[PDB]
Amino acid sequence: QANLMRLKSDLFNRSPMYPGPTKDDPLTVTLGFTLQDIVKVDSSTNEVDLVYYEQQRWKLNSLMWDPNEYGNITDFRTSAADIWTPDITAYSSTRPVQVLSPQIAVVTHDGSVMFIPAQRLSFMCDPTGVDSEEGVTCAVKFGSWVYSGFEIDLKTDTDQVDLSSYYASSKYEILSATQTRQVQHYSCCPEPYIDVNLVVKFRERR
Amino acid sequence: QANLMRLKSDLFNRSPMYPGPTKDDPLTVTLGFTLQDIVKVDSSTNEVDLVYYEQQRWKLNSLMWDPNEYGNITDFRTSAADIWTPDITAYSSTRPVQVLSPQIAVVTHDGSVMFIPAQRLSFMCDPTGVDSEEGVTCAVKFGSWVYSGFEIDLKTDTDQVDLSSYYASSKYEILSATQTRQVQHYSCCPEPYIDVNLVVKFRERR
Amino acid sequence: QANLMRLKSDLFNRSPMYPGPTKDDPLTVTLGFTLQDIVKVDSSTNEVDLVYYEQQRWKLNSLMWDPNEYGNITDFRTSAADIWTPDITAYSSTRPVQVLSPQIAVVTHDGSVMFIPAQRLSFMCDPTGVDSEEGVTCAVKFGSWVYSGFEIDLKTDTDQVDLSSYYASSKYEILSATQTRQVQHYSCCPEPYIDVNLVVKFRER
Amino acid sequence: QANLMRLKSDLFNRSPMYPGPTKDDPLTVTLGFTLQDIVKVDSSTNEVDLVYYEQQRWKLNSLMWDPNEYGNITDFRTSAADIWTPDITAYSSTRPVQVLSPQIAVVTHDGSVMFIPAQRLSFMCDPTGVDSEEGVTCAVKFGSWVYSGFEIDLKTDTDQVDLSSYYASSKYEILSATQTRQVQHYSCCPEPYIDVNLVVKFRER
Amino acid sequence: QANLMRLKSDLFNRSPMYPGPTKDDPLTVTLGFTLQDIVKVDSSTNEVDLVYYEQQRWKLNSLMWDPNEYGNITDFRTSAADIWTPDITAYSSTRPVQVLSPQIAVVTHDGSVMFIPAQRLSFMCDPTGVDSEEGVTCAVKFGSWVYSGFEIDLKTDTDQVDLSSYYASSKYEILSATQTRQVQHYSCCPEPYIDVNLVVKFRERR
Ligand SMILES: O=c1cccc2n1C[C@@H]1CNC[C@H]2C1
Ligand SMILES: O=c1cccc2n1C[C@@H]1CNC[C@H]2C1
Ligand SMILES: O=c1cccc2n1C[C@@H]1CNC[C@H]2C1
Ligand SMILES: O=c1cccc2n1C[C@@H]1CNC[C@H]2C1
Ligand SMILES: O=c1cccc2n1C[C@@H]1CNC[C@H]2C1
Ligand SMILES: [Cl-]
Ligand SMILES: [Cl-]
Ligand SMILES: [Cl-]
Ligand SMILES: [Cl-]
Ligand SMILES: [Cl-]
Ligand SMILES: [Cl-]
Ligand SMILES: [Cl-]
Ligand SMILES: [Cl-]
Ligand SMILES: [Cl-]
Ligand SMILES: [Cl-]
Ligand SMILES: [Cl-]
Ligand SMILES: [Co+2]
């Protein structure tokens, strides 16, 4: 604009597409959840539905630029189609995830990307005891579906989920909520795979 | 149409795509809601469903033209794909929004655009008390998901929502409906983000 | 096929896309409905679901050709993607419309197009009294969403909806069904907008 | 694969796309149904849901080749996107049809195509009497939506639907099932349109 | 990485698309299921809903490369769009399958591909007797929809379904689960068609 249009041109159209991470140029994705609502519980199927937004951060050398060569531009918004994004996936979903926010990300001159999709998720959770004082506890792992730890590592900035935006008049009160890095192994493949395990504890409101 | 086909060619095909707003060339979007129906209430999940159309207006120098150079044409309809549109998003939705109108916008010679999507929206709202005289109040914020106030500002032409087309046989009567600009901050980011807060107060009819 | 492939090439690939109608070159779309079923009624939300097909006709000079220059071809079927179509839209829908027929249209050498989408539609309608003798009446307007009357006019060939293909064992019987041109005004805009108002009166049993 | 990749190249990429049939180069589609399950019945609406796969066969000169010129290849599988397919459409559906099988077809050197989509279909059917010994009978017509009989004809190899794969523990027993060619006429158009009428008779267990 | 972008270019953009298998160059796909949950049962329609992921393996000469010619790269992740995939299909589904995992596969230098879609599946199954001690048994065949045994053969690495990741608090307990190769014939066609028959026996938990 002229600078931003040129910048995006140089970054995207004039290089071949970034082919994702590898054992030789791996990545670390930082995840953090903001829980907005436990919407629904179904005790006949043991499905529970969450609404949250999930903050993703990572960094690529292929997205770096010098602001002085581009009119002192330090960052920009762009369609998530223009860039690689990680295949962060819920391991116990029961319906495809529904996206609630536009697919746009923020890129910064140092190569860092931030992307914060809002989602509705149905997952496997037995709510028995939700009607009590002690409440019930459920959990779901998030991680790359296809990339091992040697390609994609995960971390959290804090193990405390953000509950400052939780709907004050939800049918369910959140007692506590945790996000914790973990390591899994699968029969398909030799390497360790990384997830962040979201653990919520909740109950019917007074 | 000779002139119109040429005009659209000159504007779209012969310039590079407008890359969205920035801190240096920011925008103001004007929003106004027209509420058509409160369709459904679900007291088991605290979700409520609205149908409205949402008027958006903004202006771009990159869409200006001189009507004399183009057969005294002052405006035209065009696919919303041909142009940039703002990522106006509901902050407490619980299902993806459903679009009820075609994705076509109106562009005027002075650069102004008008775009009025019709939508059905499920959002977080506790209807307890709806069956009473006093009714119940619920609220949902609309704003850019990814653009700060330094890129996208919002305003309303009036803080009264338009109820002139509200369904006369809806199960719910509107007592009041309000659209009001506000400023938020989030954990992700230092900058201020702008929303318009739609506040409806309603009850079972008779 | 030689001729038809060439014809379509000449019409579509070798001209710039028709940019829709304007105040200087406006259009008239002719609409007619064929009601097949009232499927469902929901008294708890006042939504009612219809299945119909909706006949659209209009005409463009940019789609004319001389049959002699193209092997005496007078018409052809083509994907609705290949051509401009009008943005005919239900003003009181409560869910996106669901399409039940393929998106293919008929173009004739004189420039006329015919396009008949089948749809299921949920719209705002209070069914109270449907269980009675007198039945109940509901209505929904169809028209362009974005084009004024100075760009798109509507007309019907007849104000009687076509009930010749209505499901004989539907849960609801049609007492009358009407399609009538009308004029509306909106807060956004000074110009008049045109619809055809479909008015159905029906009952159980 | 050398030969097959070349063959497909010669057929698809090096000719212009086949523009569908016409009065001068019409075709005949052969239809046959295999009923797998009556899944659901809804007596509140009078919708009933079927799962079947529908066999389609037709033939095009534009898909012929000589197997000697291509390594003695007599046929191949290909994406249904690569080829024209007929717009066979249920006239009394109440929801868009859901596709349960991949969209791949078989082409043979003589130009014949075979395509067998599996579908779930909701259609207009009143189940009253389903709970009895005699059961109930319902019907739905399948045919081209936009092509007349002068462009697309239909036939069946047999009027007996194939029930050898019907789910033995469905909630509903099929008593009988029929597929029969028919001719319809419409107010839009002068020409006759062709369907195959699927007629099922069934009951609760 | 330079090498990977080039590799993918050489494999995909610079060859004509692989046209699937034939009688002269047939394939064998290896299938294995990992059952995660029996989610729901509907006795009014005899539909039952499963969540599993299905491991697919096969091998193509057209996907081979020499790691030395490409910076000692032995494998990579890629969009399933970039490659042929087999048309493995459930013969008694009642709704389209819902995909729960991203559509990405792993390719290895020897030409082998691995692809593991997660799915939710509604299929024809009568649950009468599920409430008892003996439980009930249901079955669904998976195989190519269009390719005969002379084009696509199937095999399993083991006839035991993997129940190591089955939801411990599902409403239904698995008594046994089996995956077994089998041969069918159809009226359309003279050739034999191959499936793997997944047979599950289950009951209400207690
Ligand atoms: O699709 C792949 C591809 C590679 C590896 C795996 N999967 C799927 C399973 C869940 N993710 C980890 C592991 C098993
Ligand atoms: O995706 C982004 C991108 C940039 C900023 C933000 N988000 C998501 C949240 C909602 N909007 C404001 C803030 C937090
Ligand atoms: O989108 C437009 C664009 C132009 C005009 C209008 N709309 C939407 C509303 C319904 N139709 C008339 C009016 C208001
Ligand atoms: O779409 C067309 C196009 C041409 C003719 C027709 N239709 C649809 C209706 C059903 N088929 C026959 C008739 C009416
Ligand atoms: O679509 C085809 C194409 C070829 C063969 C078949 N079908 C479908 C049915 C199920 N698969 C085997 C057989 C019958
Ligand atoms: Cl600039
Ligand atoms: Cl002109
Ligand atoms: Cl509903
Ligand atoms: Cl729901
Ligand atoms: Cl649209
Ligand atoms: Cl010809
Ligand atoms: Cl329904
Ligand atoms: Cl060969
Ligand atoms: Cl259902
Ligand atoms: Cl029974
Ligand atoms: Cl459900
Ligand atoms: Co006749």
Give the containing element (helix H, strand E) for A8.
helix A3-8
Q: How far apart are CA B193 and CA B196, in angstroms?
A: 10
- In angstroms, the separation between the Cα of residue C1 and the nearest Cα of chain B is 30
Q: How far is the CA of D40 from the centre of ligand 14 (A)?
A: 8
The one-character DSSP state at B167 is -
Q: How far apart are CA D157 and CA D179, in angstroms?
A: 10
Contact status, residue E130 vs residue E136, Cβ threshold 8 Å:
yes
CA dihedral defined by E167, E172, E175, E179, rounded to 10 degrees?
-70
Coil, helix or strand for D3?
helix
Contact status, residue B88 vs residue B117, Cβ threshold 8 Å:
no
Mutate to test the pocket of ligand 1, among E116, E164, E165 (most ligand atoms within 8 A of CB): E116
Q: How far apart are CA A114 and CA A30, in angstroms?
A: 9
Closest residue by Cα to residue E60 from E42, E93, E96, E86: E86
Q: How far apart are CA B154 and CA B22, in angstroms?
A: 15
Which positions ≥6 away from C24 have C-beta within 8 Å?
none
Contact status, residue C181 vs residue C196, Cβ threshold 8 Å:
yes
- In C, which residues are within 8 Å of B103 by CB distance? none
Q: How far apart are CA E56 and CA E89, in angstroms?
A: 12
Task: Indicate the annotated binding residues of E for Mg(2+).
Answer: 75, 148, 151, 185, 191
Query: Would the annotation count D191 as a binding residue?
Result: yes
Chain A residues at the E interface, defined by Cβ less than 8 Å, are 16-17, 19-20, 22, 24-25, 44-47, 87, 89, 92-96, 124-126, 145-147, 151, 187-189
Q: How far apart are CA E91 and CA B109, in angstroms?
A: 58
The one-character DSSP state at A97 is -
* Cβ-nearest to D16 among C5, C102, C164: C5
Structure tokens that stand for D197 in this block: 């009428």
Contact status, residue A7 vs residue A54, Cβ threshold 8 Å:
no
Q: Is C146 in the pocket of ligand 3 (CB under 6 A)?
A: yes
Domain locations in chain C? 1-205
Structure tokens that stand for A71 in this block: 């009119």
Within chain A, strands assigned E span 27-42, 47-64, 75-79, 88-90, 98-99, 104-108, 110-115, 118-124, 136-144, 152-155, 172-186, 189-204
Fold of B1-206: Acetylcholine Binding Protein; Chain: A, (2.70.170)
Question: Could you give the C-alpha distances from D5 to B55, D47, D88, E145, in angstroms and in order?
Answer: 52, 46, 30, 22
Asked if D touches C (at least 3 Cβ pairs < 8 angstroms), the answer reads yes
Which positions ≥6 away from E100 have C-beta within 8 Å?
A89, A93, A95, A96, E51, E53, E117, E118, E119, E120
Asked if E touches A (at least 3 Cβ pairs < 8 angstroms), the answer reads yes
**Experimental approach:** X-ray
Q: Is B147 in the pocket of ligand 2 (CB under 6 A)?
A: no
Structure tokens that stand for E43 in this block: 């006795």
Give exposure, E28-40, as e/b (b: 16+ Cβ within 10 Å): ebbbbbbbbbbbb
Q: How far apart are CA B147 and CA D19, in angstroms?
A: 46
Contact status, residue E20 vs residue E144, Cβ threshold 8 Å:
no
The residues pairing with A110 across neighbouring beta strands, listed in sequence order, are A64
Q: Output phi, psi for A11, to 5 deg.
A: -70, -45
Q: How far apart are CA A26 and CA E172, in angstroms?
A: 40
3-state secondary structure chain E: CHHHHHHHHHHHHCCCCCCCCCCCCCEEEEEEEEEEEEEEEECCCCEEEEEEEEEEEEEEEEEECCHHHHCCCCEEEEEHHHCCCCCEEECCECCCCEECCCCEEEEECEEEEEECCEEEEEEECCCCCCCCCCCEEEEEEEEECCCCCCCEEEECCCCECECCCCCCCCCEEEEEEEEEEEEEEECCEEEEEEEEEEEEEEEECC
Q: How far apart are CA B120 and CA B48, in angstroms?
A: 10
Within A65-133, strands assigned E span 75-79, 88-90, 98-99, 104-108, 110-115, 118-124
Q: How far is the CA of E42 from the centre of ligand 15 (A)?
A: 12
Q: How far apart are CA E26 and CA E144, in angstroms?
A: 13
Closest residue by Cα to residue E61 from A91, A130, D2, A81: D2
Which positions ≥6 away from C190 have C-beta within 8 Å?
none
How many CA within 13 A on the CB side of residue C93?
Answer: 24
Q: What angle do CA D153, D198, C52 make, to 5 degrees?
A: 85
Q: How far is the CA of B114 from the centre of ligand 6 (A)?
A: 25
Size of interface B-C (CB pairs under 8 A): 73
Ligand 3 atom at minimum distance from C91 CA: 10
Chain A residues at the B interface, defined by Cβ less than 8 Å, are 1, 4-5, 8-9, 34, 36-37, 39-40, 51, 55, 71, 73, 76-77, 98-102, 104-106, 114, 116, 118, 120, 162, 164, 167, 169-171
Q: Is A64 in the pocket of ligand 2 (CB under 6 A)?
A: no
How many CA within 13 A on the CB side of residue D69?
Answer: 9
Contact status, residue A158 vs residue A178, Cβ threshold 8 Å:
no
Q: Output phi, psi for A70, to 5 deg.
A: -140, 45
Structure tokens that stand for C22 in this block: 């304007």
Q: How far apart are CA B184 and CA B182, in angstroms?
A: 7
- Residue A136: what residue type? V
Coil, helix or strand for A79?
strand
Structure tokens that stand for C199 in this block: 């008015």
Which positions ≥6 away from C57 have C-beta within 8 Å?
C29, C30, C112, C113, C114, C115
Contact status, residue A66 vs residue A108, Cβ threshold 8 Å:
no
Give the containing element (helix H, strand E) for D197.
strand D193-204
Q: How far is the CA of B151 from the centre of ligand 6 (A)?
A: 15
Q: What angle do CA C109, C115, C121 make, to 5 degrees?
A: 175
Which positions ≥6 away from B103 have C-beta within 8 Å?
B79, B80, B81, B117
The residues pairing with D64 across neighbouring beta strands, listed in sequence order, are D110
Contact status, residue C135 vs residue C64, Cβ threshold 8 Å:
no
Mutate to test the pocket of ligand 2, among A76, A101, A103, A116 (most ligand atoms within 8 A of CB): A116
Where on the phi/psi map is residue E159: left (φ > 0), alpha (ψ -120 to 50), or beta?
Answer: alpha
Q: Output phi, psi for B200, to 5 deg.
A: -115, 140
* Cβ-nearest to C171 among D45, D87, D92: D45
Contact status, residue B31 vs residue B58, Cβ threshold 8 Å:
no
Mutate to test the pocket of ligand 2, among B145, B194, B196 (most ligand atoms within 8 A of CB): B145
Neighbouring C-beta atoms of residue A149, cutoff 10 Å? 16
Contact status, residue A43 vs residue A167, Cβ threshold 8 Å:
no
- In C, which residues are within 8 Å of D49 by CB distance? none
Query: Would the annotation count A191 as a binding residue?
Result: yes
Q: How far is the CA of A95 from the centre of ligand 1 (A)?
A: 18
Fold of C1-205: Acetylcholine Binding Protein; Chain: A, (2.70.170)
Quote the distance between the C-alpha of residue A78 and its chain's center.
Answer: 18
Contact status, residue B120 vs residue B50, Cβ threshold 8 Å:
yes
Size of interface C-D (CB pairs under 8 A): 78
Neighbouring C-beta atoms of residue A53, cutoff 10 Å? 21
Residue with tokens 């534009």: D62
Closest residue by Cα to residue A147 from A26, A5, A24: A26
Residue with tokens 């026996």: E201
Contact status, residue B113 vs residue B59, Cβ threshold 8 Å:
yes
Q: How far apart are CA C139 and CA C124, in angstroms?
A: 8
- Residue C98: what residue type? Q
D-contacting chains (≥3 CB pairs under 8 Å): C, E
Contact status, residue B85 vs residue B115, Cβ threshold 8 Å:
yes
Query: Would the annotation count D173 as a binding residue?
Result: no
- Residue A17: what residue type? M
Contact status, residue C173 vs residue C100, Cβ threshold 8 Å:
no
Q: Does the beta-carbon distance from C162 to D187 stay under 8 Å?
A: yes
Question: Could you give the C-alpha distances from D149 to A33, D28, D183, D185, D193, in angstroms and in order?
Answer: 60, 9, 8, 10, 5
CA dihedral defined by D40, D44, D46, D47, rounded to 10 degrees?
-40
Which positions ≥6 away from A69 have C-beta within 8 Å?
none
Coil, helix or strand for C188?
coil
Within D43-192, strands assigned E span 47-64, 75-79, 88-90, 98-99, 104-108, 110-115, 118-124, 136-144, 152-155, 172-184
Coil, helix or strand for A9?
helix
Give the containing element (helix H, strand E) for C7.
helix C2-8
Closest residue by Cα to residue A61 from A115, A4, A6, A108: A108
Q: Given the DSSP bridges, would you call strands A172-186 and E136-144 parallel, antiparallel or unpaired?
A: unpaired
Q: What angle do CA E152, D157, D78 make, to 5 degrees?
A: 30
Residue with tokens 């994004």: A85
Residue with tokens 């970034």: A18
Q: How far apart are CA E185 and CA E194, in angstroms?
A: 9
Q: How far apart are CA B199 and CA B92, in angstroms?
A: 13
**For residue B200, with 0-12 CB atoms within 10 Å meaning exposed, 13-18 middle and 19 or more buried, which class applies?**
buried
Contact status, residue C140 vs residue C132, Cβ threshold 8 Å:
no
Q: What angle do CA A49, A55, A58 make, to 5 degrees?
A: 140
* Residues listed for chain B: 206
